[PDB]
């Protein structure tokens, strides 16, 4: 059987309450032992080890945990015995973690993120099936060199493309600019596409000596907008600002003036959009070269923030950062 | 022929350059005369008058223009001769203006907003067809008491439900929580549903004596979030804050603490979501009663902001504002 | 507590195996007693009675069962004590049954159809939550006069609009031309729209004395198509044919010739589309008046078949049937 | 400039009426000269030659035209000077032609299909932009070895995945199981994914000596279904039958019996679904091995028909054809 490590970042996503007997096997973490008792079929698929990386809701995630997680995944995948890693994660910020890992994990071995939109104690809990399917995706031969993926609701999503698009639905994850790369239905894994954007082993980013990430704020645009939030971000030491613009990345005029001042001060200003899908394009209404801004193209604000944080570990140059957005 | 007024808020959405002869008829505004020359078939459908309300891109919209527009629409629809109004508008913030009018226009006569995702001078410009269809919707007997609608890409969307969900596509408008209420295909209008949430003549809001709207800021949530933007909004005199939360409206802990302090000071804090669709629900992970927050339910951040601005013209009471979010 | 009857058309959609004790209460049907044991929370919401109408997979449905079901629902809802009916049904043809009931049930009281895309013995079975939500929708005051609805995956779909759009997903039901009319999330029911097309008490159709429905076949169009299936339908005594055309209802020329001959013989030919969404329109490429065909407008082939079957109980007149398609 | 050939299969998709002067250049086909006059910017991108392959609406397409087109495309792409082919085509059956070419063109050079949902003479015609973008996709370096693509509405779709999913909308094309592989916005081409299913140079099929394709019929399933259409297809010499089944490919019992008899006679029976998306899976409710059927997995009925036609040029063996459906 293949060997896989499950890294937990919070509580259990499958099952509820205490186990009906004390397991003889310890996987290495109580959360993971609880998963193996809730979804016993996973033991027939792989030898499972477990680790508790953090113990939080995903809305409490920080860069410090991202760095810890990425360094550990890199260590685990460098081991000959370890065939893949599965990370159990809260759904709220799963897309941000997945995208961060997709640029920092230096391996072709599968890395699968999975969660649950319903509590494990709920009627019709989705966690058990989501986990079972995640293990099957982690051990599949075709999963190699696909990048980091999210497995939810019988679907396999590329980390660059995935987002949570609904507050409550079991089918909340989507890839609105490209679609799922594959499917997993009662453990049967099939891929139909793959990303052509560089990831994992092909990424230029290396976080192995980084202890803290650069500060990047996100602003939400609207009619009758303001300069005071730009100013407060600058005052708090923001190294970058993602602006979630109206339509195709458009600012209100007062805010634009403030962003232009931020960019001149050396804070990188990257234009995204509040709309949900599509590219925030170059050479539309905003003269990015004249103002000193980067266009984020086909991302969203929260994933753009992750990429700009990584870029800022290397450079604050506008052209070099535009090239990063136009590559990854 | 029915009499309709077209109100322009910027430039032409159809045609490009100068007219091939000087019209004998003036509709009342040069922009509208240019529309009638670009889409001459509309003159066979209605007697068209025109007015220029503002001359801006929609990313430059302000509450002052919203108030001017709402008061003028109410004046026009009070005239016996005027059967409907059409408003030409930039796409970026069309959903905000439409939602504002849906709660402030005191009439059952149709109010249609229309725009264009491509320039009128572009190949395959969408403005001419969008406008032709908009006039057909405005004059249709079934359009009475539907509320304010957006007509784009052969679709009729209810203002409560409509949003721009893509940066560039001609089909960028959607109603992600309910779908379009009708269709309009080469001018043939058909309704399949109507909103059951109160609007227009049934709305409690009245802006006839309001000269300035309450300040309401929007915040974009993310991992490793901050208190400084909350604090800057408070300092700039925000009467309300929309928080675009992670997942089902969840804040990061530092931010939650700052929002709790805002709410205690009498600034209304309303929880929405950054995700794009679904309800930001009551009685999920955030104890709204204990912290002093409102749940915005099935809106999005930018329409929640419009409703909170209107609510704040009447009250800052938490319970009363929750009832308003649960009604409209 | 309100009184509701659950009518089963096959097996259980929630739970698996035998009950852990023999219930003292009999609801009136073993399948329903099994549902009450699998989802005990439903007993706190309503007094439940049960009946077994048929015992089949939905792919085995026949007009005979539709007639039995419709007559029984009409009898139950005529009783003062009965507040609503819930029908448990296989997903495959749930849309056809729902649409048939929406034109034949002469009552404003709620009629809710519900099923499960996963077996009740599966990990993460959706039936328990789907049923719980269905009962909550059946007892809600706002559900009155909404027509027949389908409740799946936390969504409320109007029967006229609903379809199964995916082979396996828990989120397979959709309303592709209009969207869901409401939501139901852990039993909390909210409506946002309603149909404006006539249904239930406002329908002209009455099946109380009908023992067998007219035969209507469906044909699937494609390049290099044929006349032999039209001919075989005619030979088998088809009273109507739904043609699932290419694009906006277009036939291949050989097939068109055969359909024109069918229509001249008195068999009603109604044009739908194989594409999945949108209206099959009048006055596009096919001259329906000259050829003797009906355009089905905003339906799909299988729901068009249901409406044409009902129309054929009354008339074979082309204009009268076009009016039926353009009304319901 | 790169040299590209445009092959027309019907009339012009852009422009309308006569040219304002007689061109000095002939591209080689009057339809193509009319395109170059309607969209003159294309002449700055490439040296364009033109050919008229057929003169029909796409609803009149036959296997004979598919064979002529595939052989000609193979001849052209074997020429050193020819960098790509563009094919103008009716939208109704564009997905079938594209899928056929994707399995029969023996080249990595780009092959782009393009059409228009509105007439060139319409207001807001989409053909001019669609064609401009199609030429930009054809000449882009990243378009090599992507397989055959459909370019519509600013989107690049893989032929294996693309379908017309709406009767009338300009955004009618979709890839419901995977999404678009790239974008093209005012000629700026970007790819985000590529198909991992074999195509073009990697396909086993070769049509160079085939003069007529095997007959394959499609049947539309429904409640109270019949055996007479199966029987008529057999009688007309069908070598294969695609069954568009209820839900996950389920037949009605009478029909299943007739299909079992067909399969025993050596007619290949392949199960697809009427639903619109998802896989028609193996090992669900239908025992394919026992009955002698193939599961078409993640296609739709009309593309399953194209693949079964090509499979039947080589074999009628059940297992071998299941492998073909599981590969391509
Ligand atoms: N708030 C939870 C949501 C979930 O996991 O569904 C989390 O993000 O940790
Ligand atoms: N930025 C423009 C976009 C458009 O109209 O499409 C506006 O909102 O005014
Ligand atoms: N074939 C089953 C499918 C389901 O219920 O999910 C039925 O239609 O009865
Ligand atoms: N019926 C036309 C439709 C179009 O091109 O949009 C065809 O397929 O040729």
Author numbering:
A (entry chain A), B (entry chain B), C (entry chain A), D (entry chain B): 3 to 330
Manuscript text:
We sought to clarify this question and to further explain the substrate discrimination, if there is any, between the two forms, by solving the crystal structures of both variants in complex with either the product Asp or L-glutamic acid (Glu).
Thus it is logical to conclude that the efficiency of active loop closing on Asn for the WoA-P121 and WoA-S121 variants would be comparable. However, as previously mentioned, soaking a WoA-P121 crystal briefly in an Asp solution was sufficient to close the N-terminal flexible loop (closed loop in pink), while multiple attempts to soak WoA-S121 crystals for many days or even co-crystallization of the WoA-S121 protein with Asp still resulted in the same Asp-bound open structure (open loop in wheat). An identical Asp binding mode was also observed between the WoA-P121 + Asp and WoA-S121 + Asp structures, despite the former having the closed, and the latter the open, N-terminal loop conformation. In contrast, when the product Asp is in the active site, the hydrogen network between the ligand and Thr14 is broken, hindering loop closure. In contrast, when serine replaces Pro121, a major stabilizing factor for Tyr27 is lost and it can no longer compensate for the lack of bonding between the ligand and Thr14, resulting in the WoA-S121 + Asp structure adopting the open conformation. To our knowledge, the WoA-S121 + Asp, WoA-S121 + Glu and WoA-P121 + Glu structures reported in this study represent the first L-asparaginase structures caught in its fully inactive/open state in the presence of product ligands, while the WoA-P121 + Asp structure is the first closed/active state of WoA reported so far.
